[PDB]
Design a protein around this ligand. Sequence first.
Ligand code: 5DK
Ligand code: 5DK
Ligand code: NA
Ligand code: NA
Lengths: 458, 452
Amino acid sequence: TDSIMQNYNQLREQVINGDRRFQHKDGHLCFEGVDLDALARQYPTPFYVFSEPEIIRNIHEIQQAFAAHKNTKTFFASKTCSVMGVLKAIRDAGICAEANSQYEVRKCLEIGFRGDQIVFNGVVKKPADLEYAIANDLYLINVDSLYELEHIDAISRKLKKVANVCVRVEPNVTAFHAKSGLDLEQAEETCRRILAMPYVHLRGLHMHVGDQVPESEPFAKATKVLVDESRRLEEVLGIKFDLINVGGGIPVPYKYDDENGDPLKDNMYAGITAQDFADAVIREVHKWRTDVEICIEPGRKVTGSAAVLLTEVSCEKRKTNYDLNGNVECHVEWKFVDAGYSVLSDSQHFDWFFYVYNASRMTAAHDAWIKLAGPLCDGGDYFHMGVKGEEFLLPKETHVGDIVAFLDAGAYTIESQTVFNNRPRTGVVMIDKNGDTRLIRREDSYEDMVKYDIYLAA
Amino acid sequence: TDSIMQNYNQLREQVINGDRRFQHKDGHLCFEGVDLDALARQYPTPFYVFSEPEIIRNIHEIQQAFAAHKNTKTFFASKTCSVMGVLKAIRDAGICAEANSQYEVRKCLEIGFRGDQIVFNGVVKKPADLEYAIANDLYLINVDSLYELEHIDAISRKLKKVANVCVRVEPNVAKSGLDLEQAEETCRRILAMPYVHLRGLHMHVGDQVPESEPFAKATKVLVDESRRLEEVLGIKFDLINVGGGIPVPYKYDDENGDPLKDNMYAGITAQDFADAVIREVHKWRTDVEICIEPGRKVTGSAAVLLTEVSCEKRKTNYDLNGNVECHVEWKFVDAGYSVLSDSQHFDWFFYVYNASRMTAAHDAWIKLAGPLCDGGDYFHMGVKGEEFLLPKETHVGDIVAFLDAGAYTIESQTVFNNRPRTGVVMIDKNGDTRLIRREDSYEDMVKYDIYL
Ligand SMILES: Cc1ncc(COP(=O)(O)O)c(/C=N/[C@H](CCCNC(=N)N)C(=O)O)c1O
Ligand SMILES: Cc1ncc(COP(=O)(O)O)c(/C=N/[C@H](CCCNC(=N)N)C(=O)O)c1O
Ligand code: NA
Ligand code: NA
């Protein structure tokens, strides 16, 4: 325990000393030079702040990782974060976009990605979705089922417009637990049929291994399956594929003290780098072709490390358990923040760990065990992914009005919010390349929330 | 397995032959005389349909349960569902409202609940929230901490307006409430505050509680301490507020269920809840007001999620190596966990039927997936393990129904993958339908962002 506390304050000092994102000023956590205590006095909490410089650094990591293969194309999985200002930053950094719904395709087109910079994935692509995608000449539509393929044939014919497709294959219980992709056994006939379709153009095969995968071997195994079948089909069908699409899954470090962690038992430890992901993928593709295009679809890695959730300590209490004779059994120091699981979904629903610190007292020892609660009704709306069990460490002097920061809060955190208890979804602030801040998403207002309803005011 | 299938089809026939909510017509599931296959051709799926008649039936069950105690006040816990048209139905049915945020208070006031019909609960009530509540003369603010109480004292003094409070106590038979040990001094201090009026004590046991003993024991704790404080402080309390938690049946075949291990079986009824509460309160006072804050029981049974079967596939495991070992039939609906949150995040069971083929045997084992990216976006709370039963005749374009989908299902939606949050339709008391919430539009989604 004392060791756990000691280790946590070693990590705290690494944040403000040797982290490319963070500094401190006046004892306050700073992000790209921006004082986060002061920022949280200018915008109402809770809100997220994103760093454009850190997104750029992440994208460079990915792109540098694939230097051994010139013919690589990188599509940001916009399901990770599709706030328009974030997408615009990713476009400016020079990569492309991946989309999982009609409205995702549309927003990518709106913000400036060309059709030939967009890949459309999904297990459900209704005819209206497919018609929209085909009419906008998307780079790829990644076909997930034979039923969807029938619609692509019929709609491409209606539009007299070529649909460019990959066939998604499940490289692997995966009949019972994997809803996506075709069985490998079905790729050959599926491809044979596409070749014969006048307006469907087979570009390659697709797979996606998973999310936050903390080892290289699954990527290597699955890529080899895809590569072996691509090679075989080239011979059997007498074709040359343009590409292979190996998906996403590059992990992000959510716990940084790798010496104390096992990525195979706790995948908050990232286990591998973008370079290890590239090495595994490229090695398997080059056993087939060095010239073929490799498409990748990273999501999490582009934005995960590039935002902080800022939330104000809004209440406090001590709760005491007594035996049946009025004698203290134990005290619990509860701190309440104005963000709960409706603001940070994965902390609750997917047992996700984020570093928690007192951004107003970043240079103070984090030396008191506390429990950290949200504002929702749910008895379960408190943060259970603690430093030790369900307990967090904050400075003993923590006060109502301090600002708490959750780090590594940029992946899958904005669109997954709700208005449970009619608490609004949060504003979002962006730090640009010059270190200046601006609001890029408003907090939901009272009006915004009732406007969807149809009713007579009393 | 053959017995699980027979039992499920027994339940299916009971839906369309012996359920006050449902009928069949032309092979289709009907809700209060409305053909749901036909309804889902008028509005884009997925969407929720609510029944005002069922809300009324549920409220009647609650109020009848408390007939032995004349002075009972019922507050709908609006966290359960605050679509304005649902709140209006509940207001028009004659009960009161409970709120868990400033904007919930405001929407309750805007739909027509008076201040004296609103209770404000919560572990975080900031000064701005408290000021709004006090200024609007709320019936109760249920005090959760000593920190909050100091703001209430200060703000009520500033406004020169009386704040009506309960003290929430956690009976330790958890983040909310004060310790019982703190009630006496807290009440003593509230009595001395010039603009705070102490109404009583408050508790809330939990959600979907499948047994009466927790309520009886928790109520007795509050009654005993209420009785004691009346003596010690020389006062008569206005009320006792015993909270919510009346369960709703999510599985109906009670003969096959253990509610204490699987709380999708309700275990008790509103009458059992009332009997326990009234039995304890009446050891002390018959004249005192009992406040109750039911949420789930008011609306849970009163909605259906309608979702179109939008894709299908067969996945075949060839021996783990080679040779057909088993086929898995996947059916994809256009609602996933961003539409029906508790099915995923809280392991919640909802009955699933093919509403387009409700009179057909549900004779085929399938797995039921949503449309999201997440490999985990499929429905795992099946009829048998993760498997569901639908007619072998099920086709893309059929309408699947999730029953009992009225509690905690609307405000918990997300726009993950930029799929819109759903529209909501209401069947009114005359059996007519209207849209009471639009589906989010594309324009809705991007309008919150600030961009060029
Ligand atoms: C075809 C495809 N291409 C790329 C990605 C990008 O994955 P990455 O962000 O790099 O881990 C995904 C991701 N899908 C989902 C995320 C789920 C996130 N869920 C969550 N609760 N945060 C999955 O792999 O299950 C995908 O489906
Ligand atoms: C003070 C208070 N008064 C009444 C209720 C109404 O409870 P009822 O709906 O009847 O079970 C609650 C309910 N709060 C929460 C629901 C949580 C629902 N969460 C969900 N994911 N569906 C709780 O008891 O944890 C409450 O906090
Ligand atoms: Na073709
Ligand atoms: Na007083």
